[PDB]
Design a protein around this ligand. Structure first.
Ligand SMILES: Cc1ncc(-c2ccc(Nc3cc4c(cn3)cc(-c3cnn(C)c3)n4C(=O)OC(C)C)cc2)n1C
Length: 262
């Protein structure tokens, strides 16, 4: 099986992932260069869903020139029936990687954290608040993490369609029933906490309702066990402040000893 994008032919090696009416493929061009092609079937898509895909593509296109920590979009084809998006190929998403790993190297953790801060800082500068950050939103491309979605369109699962997670959800979002660039700091904080302690802050709470209650309860103290990297411990405490006004910002996190000193 093959496909054509803007007069260029690509052969399909396999399906990497899926989600809703979209499929992600590992492909080769004519020079045998590897790419990821996202195919989106638009036949049963409404105006709200069309706008979400148009907005994602537009932000991907714009942000290319602003940071190398956003996945490269090389070409695309858009009609009334489908979307083809030609992107750079990555080895694995951060979530599948964190599942394989028994323990993480402190230097790899630090490098990954800096990439995540740079990618998220760039989207904030263009007025995007992701609000749904989790490790699966990051892709490893040549020892570097790259953001692959903006929380604007449908999420891809590597190849259960009910699968979600409340584990990275900021308290203000739950309370508001508010969401600012600070909301993404809390989610990045939960990812770093996972990379440090091997669990997310509220993972042990079984019931999802009890979990949401724990996220917003100031009386529920998050445990921060003593570790050799005192700067890392400090980053974690600053990110996971329940009050977003008290919570550290991304420009401040980029000037922190943990990211700048090694
Ligand atoms: C164990 C395991 N499960 C899944 C994987 C795995 C393997 C390879 C990849 N590589 C990969 C995935 C990619 C892309 C480029 N490379 C681009 C995308 C993409 C889709 N939409 N947008 C805007 C970008 N992408 C993607 O969505 O991957 C999903 C399946 C995790 C991603 C995940 N692995 C290694």
């Amino acid at each position: 099986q093959s496909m054509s994008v803007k007069g260029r032919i690509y052969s399909i090696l396999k399906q990497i992932g899926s989600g809703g009416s979209s499929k992600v493929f590992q492909v080769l061009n004519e020079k045998k260069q590897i790419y990821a092609i996202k195919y989106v079937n638009l036949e049963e898509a409404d105006n709200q869903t069309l706008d979400s895909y148009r907005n994602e593509i537009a932000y991907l296109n714009k942000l290319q020139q602003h940071s190398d920590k956003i996945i490269r979009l090389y070409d695309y084809e858009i009609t009334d029936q489908y979307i083809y998006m030609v992107m750079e190929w990555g080895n694995i998403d951060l979530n599948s990687w964190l599942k394989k790993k028994k323990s993480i190297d402190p230097w790899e953790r630090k490098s990954y954290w800096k990439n995540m801060l740079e990618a998220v800082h760039t989207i904030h500068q263009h007025g995007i608040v992701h609000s749904d950050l989790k490790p699966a939103n990051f892709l490893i491309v040549d020892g570097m993490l790259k953001l692959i979605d903006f929380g604007i369109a449908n999420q891809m699962q590597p190849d259960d369609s009910q699968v979600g997670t409340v584990n990275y959800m900021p308290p203000e979002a739950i309370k508001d029933m508010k969401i600012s660039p600070k909301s993404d700091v809390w989610s990045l904080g939960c990812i770093l906490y996972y990379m440090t302690y091997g669990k997310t802050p509220f993972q042990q709470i079984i019931n999802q309702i009890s979990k949401l209650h724990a996220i917003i309860d100031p009386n529920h103290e998050i445990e921060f066990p003593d570790i050799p990297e005192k700067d890392l411990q400090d980053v974690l405490k600053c990110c996971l402040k329940r009050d977003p006004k008290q919570r550290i910002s991304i420009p401040e996190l980029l000037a922190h000893p943990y990211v700048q000193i090694q």
